[PDB]
Write a structure and sequence with these properties.
The structure is a homodimer. Chain A is of the alpha/beta class and about 550 residues long. Chain A contains 17 helices and 18 strands. In chain A, strand 9 (about 110-115), helix 2 (about 135) and strand 10 form a beta-alpha-beta unit. The structure holds the ligand Nc1c2c(nc3cc(Cl)ccc13)C[C@H]1C=C(CCCCn3cc(CO)nn3)C[C@@H]2C1 (2 copies), 2-acetamido-2-deoxy-beta-D-glucopyranose and chloride ion (3 copies). The PDB classes it as hydrolase.
């Protein structure tokens, strides 16, 4: 028995597996359970702390993926399939993962926690691109990641019921976080240096921990990659949530025979439905044809979030908060091929003007005709109104600016203005090994592999500079994790990454070239989306 | 008694005068009556053709200027004073002026008819900048210009009434146009080739002639400099004319003293008022705090204007028409000094953000709160929103774009779409002798002295390049008058001035360098004022 690979946590004993990162060893504790499995009558309920077990629990592989819809967009293609579940689907899925260096470190080392995204309807911590060997090996970090319930299981809500209260997916994350307070010391990590980081819904989730009081004392610093809690997709109102829950139920059994008294009678019936029945109907509840909108997402309940994220980033006190936030170069491109007519990976998607107008209604489902028109106005080249290249790229900026870029800038701006230290970036590097067309640029989420150090592992066939690049990234992230500043703490010329400020609006390019400072993250456009358009949507 | 200075026209005989241009003599016949004096009971009435006279009418000097408001912005300043009346004010003012080569030309010469501007409230054909002797001597042109009634005298309307039908200043112009058909042959001009040109309200009037059938038959080609019949200031509805006319009456004591009367009674009361009382009250009737809005302008009466200029341009057939239109570099600057707080000729006029926002409301008086916010959204630099140099230039562009540039762009595009040959330009040269400050650039009106060839008079102190440049401009205009193309025909390698078309949106810049071809006349911004803002303003 290897004493490194065996740890005791408050619930009992665990056995890790020794892992061979390309520059030496690491200890992995995979599949540690942090909650009672939320099944049977616990479906839709807040998670409960895992009861203590006896014996030695085998922590040597990834546990089940939380039950979820699986995209069938391009069956067979690694571009999409790299993102699909890689373990069996199960409602029994509340498990986290821990990576420490081998051997267990020196003194209390800074802790990174990953929260995966996927529109709150998909994702798994067990994915290749989220493998924490490298950050732990190469930078001596303790890297934690958890599974949390998605779709209906995590976010179906009958607001104000005891029984399907909403936001239980975030409660899952909050429980994994509490577990790190209580247990990470045992692996080397430091409970007083905890940094969150996530991408998409993962970032929106980090956002939400920033915004929810009971979460604040469980972490110190935060990274939001390509996603924010404010913005058009990451929350719904209590009333739209009830509408969606009630309609979902009605379509499966639920309650039986048009009966509408007890919300708990409604939920009891839903708990009798096979998991696949729920997933089978989850898309049917959206209110219009759209993209970048998801059926079951965090709800503004007056509870986990005491007001909307918009209201809560305006009025917050954020003195003691260091944050790092950014976007990739082409946030919008995946979304088009996913759900706007005219866009594919197989041709190169030079659309007509009609397609672009139709695309704007799909990309901006909440828009009235006048709002839709405002959007067309800003994004059209009135000199070349039908240049199919311009149209294609424009349609991509609409979706990416509306959903990601501008809410990131809004977030950066409000946090800076309310006392936070904020660093911002834009990721413009396109991987040599990417298999999506050139027209798609750097799409949503293809910075993850470089933050995670995957271009290390040389059997992946990442170029030599991609490798150096990855190491820079890993430095910035872990630097930020340690200090609240991604800059090298004594570095002779690099240069600096300055804080983002409302006054100067500085943010850095992240590519193969050295760090370049820029000013105004799509400033004119974000003024359109963040100040003007809301005024025009309401009143219209 | 030169047989060259003596002429018989339908009404009788006239004697003109031999004048020295720089390059040789010209013949001028100034002060020719083309209508019966519109005084006494003829105030506000359509003009009547001048009755035949006997003897030789002395046509050797300019006649009285139509009654009008005299501007007092900078008393004693040359820059403002070159525009003011230079003969006595009088209601007896319907006179025209002809300039031809001396001796009178041997072949029928293309005729150029100039219509001055002045916001429909000021102007005279006798200003030094409207002197036809250069075009006559250098290009062999027959140049005509008329006085037409301005302000209340020309545009006070009780629409539907007999005694004040409206548009009577347009009718003054039309009668001068008829007089040209009937009589120009006697001076050597060709009535089969008549080109109208005008600036500002002069240009708006030219466009109104294009759009009114009884005017169309009297001319062949038109030139519009910095004004258009469509747009926010050139016309008013019948309702608003009636409300302004009735208010003016009330202010000068016309019910008399009691109620609101017949139209007949109100007009007869107005006719008893001295001219200066009417001039004195004409600004009193404007509805809002504004710039670039005038009290008494052409009314949409369903007679002269059978529908709005906007409607008429969207639906006419303009196949037989050639038009040359364009703008100066800084259309709005003068208006800022006239009426927007923060702007002055005596300093650089750097303004604060609050001033820019107040300015937008003055410059776009019809705008609702949200419409004004759209303007501010468009023109703010969101990276440097308080930059005072930027704000000052923005404030100028808002006013220039809204009132002149964009309405010009709309006319050029509608006319080209409906089959007109169109040429468009931007005049970018700042007179070496200009006395307005640098920040004002090339203001409204300041291309006129170049078109009319004033730089050819070496006592005015323009540079040599200015003289070369005036020569070029005169050729373009007279080439256009002769053929409907401003290009030099027996020539090549100039460059060419291509027609403005809706696909390519080509226009040229006119300055000391050779013609540069540019594409899209403020395209992004004009799509804003011309397509989006009306929808927003009507939805709001
Ligand atoms: N599956 C992907 C993910 C990511 N990026 C991908 C990029 C490409 Cl080119 C292809 C697939 C991707 C990043 C993370 C975010 C998601 C959410 C994907 C949402 C797709 N979607 C569904 C809808 C509903 O109409 N709208 N958009 C899912 C996952 C994690
Ligand atoms: N008097 C001027 C004219 C011209 N350009 C001038 C430029 C400068 Cl910088 C100074 C005076 C100018 C060109 C022609 C047009 C006019 C109309 C002036 C309208 C001013 N105004 C008054 C109002 C009332 O709010 N709004 N704008 C008047 C006249 C002919
Ligand atoms: C035990 C309890 O507290 N409440 C339940 C109620 O909600 C339910 O609708 C019914 C039995 O199904 O009667 C009882
Ligand atoms: Cl830059
Ligand atoms: Cl003289
Ligand atoms: Cl004089």
């Amino acid at each position: 028995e290897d004493p490194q690979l065996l740890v005791r946590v408050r619930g009992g004993q665990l056995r890790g597996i020794r892992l061979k990162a390309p520059g030496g060893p690491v200890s992995a504790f995979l599949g540690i359970p942090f909650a009672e499995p939320p099944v049977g009558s616990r479906r839709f309920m807040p998670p409960e702390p895992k009861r203590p077990w006896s014996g030695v629990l085998d922590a040597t592989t990834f546990q089940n993926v939380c039950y979820q819809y699986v995209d069938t967009l391009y069956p067979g293609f690694e571009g999409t399939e790299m993102w699909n579940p890689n373990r069996e689907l199960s409602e029994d899925c509340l498990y986290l993962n821990v990576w420490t260096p081998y051997p267990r470190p020196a003194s209390p080392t800074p802790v990174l926690i990953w929260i995966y995204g996927g529109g709150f309807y998909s994702g798994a911590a067990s994915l290749d691109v989220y493998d924490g060997r490298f950050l732990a090996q190469v930078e001596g970090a303790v890297l934690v990641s958890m599974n949390y319930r998605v779709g209906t299981f995590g976010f179906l809500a009958l607001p104000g019921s005891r029984e399907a209260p909403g936001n239980v997916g975030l409660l899952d994350q909050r429980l994994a976080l509490q577990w790190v307070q209580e247990n990470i010391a045992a692996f080397g990590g430091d409970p007083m240096s905890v940094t969150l980081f996530g991408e998409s819904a993962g970032a929106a989730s980090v956002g939400m921990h920033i915004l929810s009081l009971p979460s604040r004392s469980l972490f110190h610093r935060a990274v939001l990659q390509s996603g924010t809690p404010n913005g058009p997709w990451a929350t719904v109102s209590a009333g739209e949530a009830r509408r969606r829950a009630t309609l979902l139920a009605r379509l499966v059994g639920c309650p039986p025979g048009g009966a509408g008294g007890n919300d708990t009678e409604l939920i009891a019936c839903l708990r009798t439905r096979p998991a696949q029945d729920l997933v089978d109907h989850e898309w049917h509840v959206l209110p219009q044809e759209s993209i970048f909108r998801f059926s079951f997402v965090p709800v503004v309940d007056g509870d986990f979030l005491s007001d909307t994220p918009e209201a809560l980033i305006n009025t917050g006190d954020f003195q003691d908060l260091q944050v790092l936030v950014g976007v990739v170069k082409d946030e919008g491109s995946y979304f088009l091929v996913y759900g706007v007519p005219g866009f594919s990976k197989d041709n190169e998607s030079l659309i007509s003007r009609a397609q672009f107008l139709a695309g704007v209604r799909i990309g901006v489902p909440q828009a009235s005709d006048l709002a839709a028109e405002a959007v067309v106005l800003h994004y059209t080249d009135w000199l070349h109104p039908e240049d199919p290249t311009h149209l294609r790229d424009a349609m991509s900026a609409v979706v990416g600016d509306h959903n990601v870029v501008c809410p990131v800038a809004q977030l950066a701006g409000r946090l800076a203005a309310q006392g936070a230290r904020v660093y911002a970036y834009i990721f413009e590097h396109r991987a040599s090994t990417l298999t999506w067309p050139l027209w798609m640029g750097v799409p949503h989420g293809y910075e993850i592999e470089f933050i995670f150090g995957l271009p290390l592992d040389p059997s992946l066939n990442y170029t030599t500079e991609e490798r150096i690049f990855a190491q820079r990234l890993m430095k910035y992230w872990t630097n930020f994790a340690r200090t609240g500043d991604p800059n090298d703490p004594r570095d002779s010329k690099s240069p600096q990454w300055p804080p983002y400020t409302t006054a100067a609006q500085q943010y850095v390019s992240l590519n193969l070239k050295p760090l370049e400072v820029r000013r105004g993250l799509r400033a004119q456009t974000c003024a359109f989306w963040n100040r003007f358009l809301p005024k025009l949507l309401s009143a219209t």
